[PDB]
Amino acid sequence: SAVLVTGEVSNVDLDKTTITISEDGKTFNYNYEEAIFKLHNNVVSQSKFESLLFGATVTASKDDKGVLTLNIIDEGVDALEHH
């Protein structure tokens, strides 16, 4: 499960299910539609994940089969709180 990046979520687009993750001045973009979602390594639903996603710290990783996992390390807030 190669790690792609660990860092802060920005630019959350819930409609397009896309995020940007930033680490060390670099930006990584993901469509999380088909991702496995975790919260402190606990598997969770998309909805739960999105509820804590804005400004979250997330690790993005991919197994040998190309399946994307997005794990919230440090909790963000929901779309409505973010405003």
* 3-state DSSP of the chain: CEEEEEEEEEEEECCCCEEEEEECCEEEEEECCCCEEEECCEEECHHHHHHCCECCEEEEEECCCCCEEEEEEECCECHHHHC
How many structural domains are present in the chain? Answer: 1
Planar angle of CA 7, 10, 14, nearest 5 degrees: 125
Q: Distance between CA atoms of 11 and 70, rounded to whole angstroms?
A: 15
Cα 56 to the chain's mean position, in Å?
A: 8
| Cα 58 to Cα 25, 28, 31, distances in angstroms | 15, 11, 14
Q: Distance between CA atoms of 26 and 15, rounded to whole angstroms?
A: 24
Instruction: Answer whether 73's CB lies under 8 Å from 40's CB.
Output: yes
Q: Distance between CA atoms of 14 and 35, rounded to whole angstroms?
A: 14
Amino acid at 4: L
Cα 20 to the chain's mean position, in Å?
A: 8
Q: Distance between CA atoms of 64 and 51, rounded to whole angstroms?
A: 29
Domain span holding position 24: 2-82
State this model's resolution in angstroms.
2.1
The experimental technique behind this entry is: X-ray
